[PDB]
Amino acid sequence: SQIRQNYSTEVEAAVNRLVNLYLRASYTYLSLGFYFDRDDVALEGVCHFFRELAEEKREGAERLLKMQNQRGGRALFQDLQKPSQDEWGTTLDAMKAAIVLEKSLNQALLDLHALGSAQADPHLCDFLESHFLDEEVKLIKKMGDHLTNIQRLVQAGLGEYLFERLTL
Amino acid sequence: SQIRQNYSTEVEAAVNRLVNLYLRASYTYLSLGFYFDRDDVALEGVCHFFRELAEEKREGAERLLKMQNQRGGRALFQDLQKPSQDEWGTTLDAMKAAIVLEKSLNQALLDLHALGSAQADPHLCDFLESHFLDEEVKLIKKMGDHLTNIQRLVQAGLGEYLFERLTL
Amino acid sequence: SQIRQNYSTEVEAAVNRLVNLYLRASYTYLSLGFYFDRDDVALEGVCHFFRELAEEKREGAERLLKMQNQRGGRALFQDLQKPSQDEWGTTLDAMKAAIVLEKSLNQALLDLHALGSAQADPHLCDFLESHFLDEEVKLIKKMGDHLTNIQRLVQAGLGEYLFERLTL
Amino acid sequence: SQIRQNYSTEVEAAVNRLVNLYLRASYTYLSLGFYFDRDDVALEGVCHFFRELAEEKREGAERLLKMQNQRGGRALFQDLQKPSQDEWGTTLDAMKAAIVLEKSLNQALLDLHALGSAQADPHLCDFLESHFLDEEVKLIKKMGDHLTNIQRLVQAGLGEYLFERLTL
Amino acid sequence: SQIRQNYSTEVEAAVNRLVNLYLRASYTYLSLGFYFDRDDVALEGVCHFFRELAEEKREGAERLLKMQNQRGGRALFQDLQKPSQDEWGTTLDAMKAAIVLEKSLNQALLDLHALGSAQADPHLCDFLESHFLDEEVKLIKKMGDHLTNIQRLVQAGLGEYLFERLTL
Numbered sequence: 001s002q003i004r005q006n007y008s009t010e011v012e013a014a015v016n017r018l019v020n021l022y023l024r025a026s027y028t029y030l031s032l033g034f035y036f037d038r039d040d041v042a043l044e045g046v047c048h049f050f051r052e053l054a055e056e057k058r059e060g061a062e063r064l065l066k067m068q069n070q071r072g073g074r075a076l077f078q079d080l081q082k083p084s085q086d087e088w089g090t091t092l093d094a095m096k097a098a099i100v101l102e103k104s105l106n107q108a109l110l111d112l113h114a115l116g117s118a119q120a121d122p123h124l125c126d127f128l129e130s131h132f133l134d135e136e137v138k139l140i141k142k143m144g145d146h147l148t149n150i151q152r153l154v155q156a157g158l159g160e161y162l163f164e165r166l167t168l
Numbered sequence: 169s170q171i172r173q174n175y176s177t178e179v180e181a182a183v184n185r186l187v188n189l190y191l192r193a194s195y196t197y198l199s200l201g202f203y204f205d206r207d208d209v210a211l212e213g214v215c216h217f218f219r220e221l222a223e224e225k226r227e228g229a230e231r232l233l234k235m236q237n238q239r240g241g242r243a244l245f246q247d248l249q250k251p252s253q254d255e256w257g258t259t260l261d262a263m264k265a266a267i268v269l270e271k272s273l274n275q276a277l278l279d280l281h282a283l284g285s286a287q288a289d290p291h292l293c294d295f296l297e298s299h300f301l302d303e304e305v306k307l308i309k310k311m312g313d314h315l316t317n318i319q320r321l322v323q324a325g326l327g328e329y330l331f332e333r334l335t336l
Numbered sequence: 337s338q339i340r341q342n343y344s345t346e347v348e349a350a351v352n353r354l355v356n357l358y359l360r361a362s363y364t365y366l367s368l369g370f371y372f373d374r375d376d377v378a379l380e381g382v383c384h385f386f387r388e389l390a391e392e393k394r395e396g397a398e399r400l401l402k403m404q405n406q407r408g409g410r411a412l413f414q415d416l417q418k419p420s421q422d423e424w425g426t427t428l429d430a431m432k433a434a435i436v437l438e439k440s441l442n443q444a445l446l447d448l449h450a451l452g453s454a455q456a457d458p459h460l461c462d463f464l465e466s467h468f469l470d471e472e473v474k475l476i477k478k479m480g481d482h483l484t485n486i487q488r489l490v491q492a493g494l495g496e497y498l499f500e501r502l503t504l
Numbered sequence: 505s506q507i508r509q510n511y512s513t514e515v516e517a518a519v520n521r522l523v524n525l526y527l528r529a530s531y532t533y534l535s536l537g538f539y540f541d542r543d544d545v546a547l548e549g550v551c552h553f554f555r556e557l558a559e560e561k562r563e564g565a566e567r568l569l570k571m572q573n574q575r576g577g578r579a580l581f582q583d584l585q586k587p588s589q590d591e592w593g594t595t596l597d598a599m600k601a602a603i604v605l606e607k608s609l610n611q612a613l614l615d616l617h618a619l620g621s622a623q624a625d626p627h628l629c630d631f632l633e634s635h636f637l638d639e640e641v642k643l644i645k646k647m648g649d650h651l652t653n654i655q656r657l658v659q660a661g662l663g664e665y666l667f668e669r670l671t672l
Numbered sequence: 673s674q675i676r677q678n679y680s681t682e683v684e685a686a687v688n689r690l691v692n693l694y695l696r697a698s699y700t701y702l703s704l705g706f707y708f709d710r711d712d713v714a715l716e717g718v719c720h721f722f723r724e725l726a727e728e729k730r731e732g733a734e735r736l737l738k739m740q741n742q743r744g745g746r747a748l749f750q751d752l753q754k755p756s757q758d759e760w761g762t763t764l765d766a767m768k769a770a771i772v773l774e775k776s777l778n779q780a781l782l783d784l785h786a787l788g789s790a791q792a793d794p795h796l797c798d799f800l801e802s803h804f805l806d807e808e809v810k811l812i813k814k815m816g817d818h819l820t821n822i823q824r825l826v827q828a829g830l831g832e833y834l835f836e837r838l839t840l
């Protein structure tokens with residue numbers, strides 16, 4: 001690439017993997033969102049919580065793809081595996097899965113940051129810092145808060161309804 | 169002091185002690201507020217209730233320091249001891265501690281007022297009356313109301329959630 | 337903590353110490369501010385300069401406490417020692433003490449950043465960079481400028497008056 | 505008086521004396537104000553400072569006369585003695601005289617308050633508290649601040665000019 | 673050049689030299705400006721005075737380059753020598769250097785105008801008259817005024833502070 005400078009092939013490849021992770025996460029949240037839109041689940045607040053996350057994750061992927069091109073790396077797309085579940089159980093089950101999911105994204109972010117440090121790629125580090133690292137931390141704190149409130153509320157049916165009505 | 173008039177050394181010293189009490193109270197509410205901001209406590213309404221109180225108590229201290237200077241007394245600051253607890257338990261536990269705290273502030277206000285009467289310091293008395301005495305009484309009534317409602321709600325997890333959602 | 341990830345116990349403890357440092361600094365500026373509000377000192381511009389700093393330092397502490405919770409660390413509060421002085425002398429004396437104070441805060445920030453690097457905690461590093469490091473540098477430059485102007489003006493009484501009137 | 509209730513003849517008489525004191529003070533400030541308006545004194549800021557005080561003192565007298573009538577006391581006016589000086593010297597001289605003056609007013613206020621306590625006249629006490637006591641304290645603090653700044657500035661001619669230009 | 677008409681090679685070359693002079697002047701003012709922004713100099717008004725001049729001189733150069741092209745002359749750029757000093761001393765020192773600098777620019781303008789007369793180039797003369805000659809005269813008068821006021825003020829530290837505060 002005529003523009004490529006200080007951009008290691010290792011980071012380039014890891015960015016492509018992270019794109020796949022973010023699109024996988026988006027797909028997972030799409031599935032979560034529509035599960036809670038089921039007539040036999042019917043928790044609209046939960047559906048909107050996860051649909052908004054699907055969108056955030058997709059935008060994460062796009063931001064990465066844009067940066068990939070800005071550095072002169074080459075996007076390589078791979079198959080996107082389907083979410084790990086077809087049905088997601090209670091709001092509690094779903095929020096637990098989501099936080100596991102976010103932690104895995106966060107760890108991939110940290111790994112990519114470590115890679116960038118090792119490759120002495122300060123632009124990559126700045127990029128991760130500005131658009132991802134604090135985002136993840138805040139999201140995970142939020143999910144932690146929700147988990148705690150969901151769990152305080154478990155009259156399990158009553159609790160699930162109230163959480164969706166009054167928090168989500 | 170060129171401006172000092174009818175301001176006893178006893179009141180001056182007691183005002184300095186009260187400043188320390190108010191800053192101690194502010195510190196206590198800071199600790200309360202951030203405890204409820206913990207991901208494993210997660211009661212945002214409670215966190216905001218106590219953070220607002222931290223701010224009120226700090227402003228109380230400042231009002232006292234300003235009056236101290238207006239009378240030609242000399243501010244003397246002392247170490248501020250840390251709050252009595254590191255973790256504050258339930259909203260009920262926390263509100264009980266807060267009302268104990270406010271009662272102690274109120275008693276210090278009353279003591280200072282008695283001192284002012286004994287020292288025949290009508291400016292001090294007016295000052296306490298305008299900016300503190302009714303404030304405390306109203307705050308303590310509010311905390312009393314909350315305690316009663318919190319207690320009515322003890323499904324303890326459910327009650328704590330509902331109180332935070334619908335009152336705080 | 338359910339949310340805690342890549343947050344070392346060393347950083348957690350150092351963040352708690354830094355909170356104590358920032359609250360100590362806030363307390364010091366409170367004392368500075370009210371000293372200059374004394375009828376026998378009477379430099380309103382200086383009083384407002386330091387009172388605004390007290391507020392900035394308190395907000396620094398709060399930002400740290402919020403981040404502590406966001407990472408799943410646990411706030412631990414300690415006694416706050418009283419400021420190093422009861423009276424602060426001239427504006428020059430006071431500004432010299434303030435810059436010593438800011439340098440000590442800045443050094444604690446740098447130490448904490450070094451700790452974060454050693455612990456490979458990129459979120460911590462981003463956090464310090466966004467909300468503290470440049471803030472300190474700018475504040476210290478400002479105090480440096482003031483010190484130089486104060487010193488140019490030492491007709492010491494005249495100089496102190498003019499600085500407060502025309503700069504502060 | 506058909507309306508008179510709990511209003512002692514002692515307080516009534518003391519209110520009349522205080523009216524005379526306030527009108528005397530107003531007259532003194534009138535003299536101060538116009539002295540600084542002299543072509544050979546020419547300190548417009550000082551002239552306006554004292555003219556505004558003349559007006560405040562006159563309004564104090566009126567407030568007292570209104571209260572006198574509200575309680576069913578009878579205003580009795582006496583000769584108003586001329587101010588203690590015909591020329592007031594420097595701004596420093598003038599501000600020193602003013603603070604002596606305000607202290608004497610404040611002491612008369614305190615005496616009247618003590619009288620009211622002894623006579624168990626809570627309306628009188630409330631009246632003094634709302635409209636005079638804090639007013640005096642604030643004014644005296646202000647004059648204290650000015651005295652300190654004036655004195656810091658004593659290049660006596662230069663200092664007097666700068667104070668008037670930059671503070672008054 | 674297809675457009676070149678009545679534009680002597682002598683004027684063309686002299687315009688290129690004048691561009692170098694104006695860029696040199698801009699560089700000198702950049703250095704002046706940032707010197708006064710030093711924490712140990714700290715005269716913000718002086719810094720802004722010289723930074724604005726740096727910008728004016730750069731725009732002078734650009735205006736000349738534009739005219740060069742409008743006449744069908746060819747811009748030829750040369751090395752720009754660094755300013756004559758690294759540190760500029762007092763405001764007085766700096767303003768003296770600036771006026772020497774402006775006089776040298778003005779003389780180069782006059783020389784170029786004389787050249788234009790000799791070459792019977794009325795467009796060049798009009799150009800210098802409209803955009804430079806009166807500009808220089810006004811700037812030099814301004815610097816003359818400042819020099820006189822700076823010098824009246826030499827309590828050298830006090831004077832330098834007051835000039836920056838009240839004139840610049």
Ligand SMILES: CCCCC/C=C\C/C=C\C/C=C\C/C=C\CCCC(=O)O
Pocket residue numbers: 023026027030051054055056058
């Ligand atoms: C502007 C609103 C966007 C809302 C997006 C919400 C959820 C996204 C759901 C699934 C995305 C996962 C895989 C789809 C593959 C590519 C998406 C195209 C990018 C886009 O479509 O941009």
Ligand SMILES: CCCCC/C=C\C/C=C\C/C=C\C/C=C\CCCC(=O)O
Pocket residue numbers: 191194195198222223224226359362363366387390391392394
């Ligand atoms: C919103 C205005 C804030 C102005 C603050 C200015 C000065 C703060 C002075 C002292 C603070 C130092 C110790 C007090 C302990 C806790 C403060 C409560 C937090 C808050 O009170 O938030």
Ligand SMILES: CCCCC/C=C\C/C=C\C/C=C\C/C=C\CCCC(=O)O
Pocket residue numbers: 527530531534555558559560562
């Ligand atoms: C509405 C503007 C009032 C400005 C007053 C400023 C200075 C007052 C000066 C002298 C007053 C002292 C004795 C005069 C006696 C009675 C004043 C009439 C009440 C009034 O005149 O009300």
Ligand SMILES: CCCCC/C=C\C/C=C\C/C=C\C/C=C\CCCC(=O)O
Pocket residue numbers: 695698699702723726727728730
């Ligand atoms: C629009 C704001 C302009 C502010 C300019 C202020 C100072 C200029 C400082 C140094 C210029 C001297 C040499 C630089 C060489 C070419 C400048 C590019 C022209 C431009 O940069 O135009």
